[PDB]
């Protein structure tokens, strides 16, 4: 299932970071994922290719200029054809988590709009944007890294490209590393013991580090047992 | 106040996205920010430059191979000299928010370790890593985009590079956009009316979209008043 993602950005070359390297790079090369960028700078008509503009009401900072951005978005929509969801990467957006990723990944076509400066005109959000999404409650210099993050996350759902708990600890060679040994169970070859140990560790780590994540889960009987055991061992 | 960030990554060229463009690109060019990358691949000794290894206990997936990664980290620490905090970008880490960004930005030197595959050996975390940080509860293909995100966020705190509520809506030219007008107050030139309108909008948007953020705030008398007004107007 091919995925097409249109991107609107003043810095399209940043996206080489996902299109030319690693798992996402492979997805692009193998035509599993297509990423197409439009730069508002290319839709300007003045000599100096102006892409920013002053906010009504004054104050510091600039906004993205409406006409070049609007025209870039319209061009991306035309290329997408029917059914593309238009996303504005924004601190005022819905907070991205894995549930949200799975939801966005159901779309075969996405258009991602990346803001710079103090953002974009509110009326463009109303008229051009379907959904606003935030990758986190921290402040960045532009929407490009959030767009790249979202692309990487949804790309994992495309066939051929590759449960609520934190991961268990992992171990590889050597058997002893600065005096620290590998848990003997992992050397046992007992597949079922290994599975249960890993699940128990995941439950313990989630409880200790991110206990709010547990409250959102309906633990299985097995998970309830192993969590109880982990909590008992923790309390010695 | 110069910031130095050492990066450990199998895909160092991804970091061109922040070092060659925009605000962070300027910071690098002006020597406000230095980003130095070491690639574990360069610390391998076998013919095929192997950087992954099998997990004890079996199961699918690979881990980063310990020796090349350990050697890369040691080299970065040597370059950093005294006082560098070593960060592992990890889904099992502390959740990044702006408070966390401000905390990390107090460091003049950081080393960021980027994992690939199923991650890194737990004993390396114990022996080499100071803090684990996550940029969000979503699954990515590697630690590079999180590291880049963190760099961008902390870079904003460096002098010369450039309150808990969502931003107010912003408007720029034209005065009318597909029939939608700019709020008259923003055209008034009344600086104090404009300030209060923007603050009120911020409070309203936070309440409607992210009400949990409000509970974490000690609103000023003015903010309490404007929020009450916004809620009254919302209830018509
Ligand atoms: C999405 C977008 C942003 C952002 N900051 C500046 C321009 N876009 C931050 C977090 N999630
Ligand atoms: C930090 C790191 C990650 C991550 N996923 C895969 C390797 N590193 C995800 C979120 N925050």
UniProtKB/Swiss-Prot annotation, chains A, B:
Protein name per Swiss-Prot or TrEMBL: tRNA (guanine-N(1)-)-methyltransferase
Family: Belongs to the RNA methyltransferase TrmD family.
Listed GO MF terms: tRNA (guanine(37)-N1)-methyltransferase activity
EC number: 2.1.1.228
UniProt cross-references to CDD domains, sorted A to Z: TrmD-like (cd18080)
Gene that encodes the chain: trmD
Cell compartments where the protein resides: Cytoplasm
Organism: Haemophilus influenzae (strain ATCC 51907 / DSM 11121 / KW20 / Rd)
InterPro entries xref list: Alpha/beta_knot_MTases, tRNA_m1G_MeTrfase_C_sf, tRNA_m1G_MeTrfase_TrmD, tRNA_m1G_MTases_N, tRNA_MeTrfase_TRMD/TRM10
Gene3D superfamilies: 3.40.1280.10, tRNA(m1g37)methyltransferase, domain 2
Tagged with keyword Transferase: yes
GO cellular-component term (any): cytosol
Subunit-structure text: Homodimer.
